[PDB]
Design a protein around this ligand. Structure first.
Ligand SMILES: O=P(O)(O)OC[C@H]1O[C@H](OP(=O)(O)OP(=O)(O)O)[C@H](O)[C@@H]1O
Ligand SMILES: O=P(O)(O)OC[C@H]1O[C@H](OP(=O)(O)OP(=O)(O)O)[C@H](O)[C@@H]1O
Lengths: 209, 209
């Protein structure tokens, strides 16, 4: 495939990216949410879309299996963004990385154990608080961990806070704001700039309003 | 909670475990597939169920956040089973760990790159073939990886083989057979044996027929 391959993920990233794509002249020809297919043509024959797990977007873009992609800052921080270029903050799929635990549970006076998917972000954040923590790696449902006593806190993304509230948890610390970012393969940026440029300019214009 | 906490995962593990549980006198009181809730009472007041991501079952059981659980051999091999006891092969959710690639694609004469979730299993398998491979860690949709040239092969579970066939891929090597296994926390095994024992005996009896 000679053109550009764009990496997206299902849910909020797909939904909130599509209007940027539309204004940039790119529209999907069916709903990826309703297909098991993974590669999708678009209204532009030079652009195709990969639908990936959010955690795999940086990986595909880094290796050049996608030329560019839309990834959450949370995923970028966790994966490491040293081998892609972060070109734009798209200001979509906004949320916060936070620490949380059982409401009014006292913290134990010992090395804390942090149940989380975000092991690198947990370690770096807690290091900034003077804290060398243990991490317990999980793949999902962080909110259960404090209810069964797995770790002392979690680190997870919080949007409305409804998940935390539904489970008797409250945010302890705000780590950072998260939004989806446009990332580009370091070589594709150089080799396919004439294809990327009008799309980047459109996105940038769109984000201003 | 004084009783036993059982870790399960959604889909085939939940579906195929429920009959064993029923024969052991444990029935869920609603369908976990239709709830966002994670802890579930059962017909037995001494048994509750956690619904977890399959990859987190060994973790919860290891730490004692669950006393026992049902995990796929694939997950156990990848996570490491050195800090739980594998008590039974339940013979449910049967599948195979396999290597696969694009159909009739020749392997490149260099260090292979293996796109997979199963990074430890990929490295150990290929080591047995005299091969020190690079791994590219992914979280899902392994079948896409060879279609976009991310890695040379994948390692993933194969059941019917329909996923591979739908994507123009074929299995190259059979790594091992996979089935769901009953695992127990090493301390719970010792402290809660009188609760576990009749349930284990029931499962063992059930698996014989
Ligand atoms: O603060 P809230 O508005 O309750 O949202 C927080 C949830 O969002 C994230 O999940 P993600 O968005 O990846 O998928 P989900 O919302 O479908 O769980 C995260 O894992 C929390 O479960
Ligand atoms: O050989 P097949 O019968 O096509 O099945 C193989 C699929 O099964 C596994 O997924 P899992 O069972 O975890 O969930 P899924 O089947 O819903 O993808 C694996 O990740 C493959 O995608």
């Amino acid at each position: 495939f000679l053109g550009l391959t764009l990496a997206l993920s299902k849910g909020r990233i797909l939904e909130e990216t599509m209007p940027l794509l539309r204004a940039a002249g790119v529209e999907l020809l069916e709903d990826p949410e309703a297909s098991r297919k993974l590669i999708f043509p678009t209204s532009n024959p030079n652009v195709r879309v990969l639908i990936l797990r959010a955690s795999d977007v940086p990986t595909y873009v880094e290796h050049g299996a996608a030329d560019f992609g839309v990834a959450g800052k949370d995923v970028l921080l966790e994966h490491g963004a040293n081998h892609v270029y972060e070109l734009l903050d798209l200001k979509i799929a906004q949320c916060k990385l936070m620490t949380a635990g059982v409401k009014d549970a006292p913290l134990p006076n010992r090395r804390l154990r942090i149940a989380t998917k975000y092991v690198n972000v947990a370690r770096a954040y807690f290091a900034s608080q003077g804290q060398q923590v243990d991490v317990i790696k999980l793949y999902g449902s962080m909110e259960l961990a404090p209810l069964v006593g797995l770790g002392d806190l979690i680190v997870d993304v919080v949007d409305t806070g409804n998940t935390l509230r539904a489970n008797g948890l409250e945010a302890r610390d705000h780590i950072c704001d998260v939004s989806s970012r446009l990332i580009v393969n370091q070589v594709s940026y150089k080799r396919k700039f004439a294809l990327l440029e009008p799309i980047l300019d459109s996105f940038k214009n769109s984000i201003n309003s």
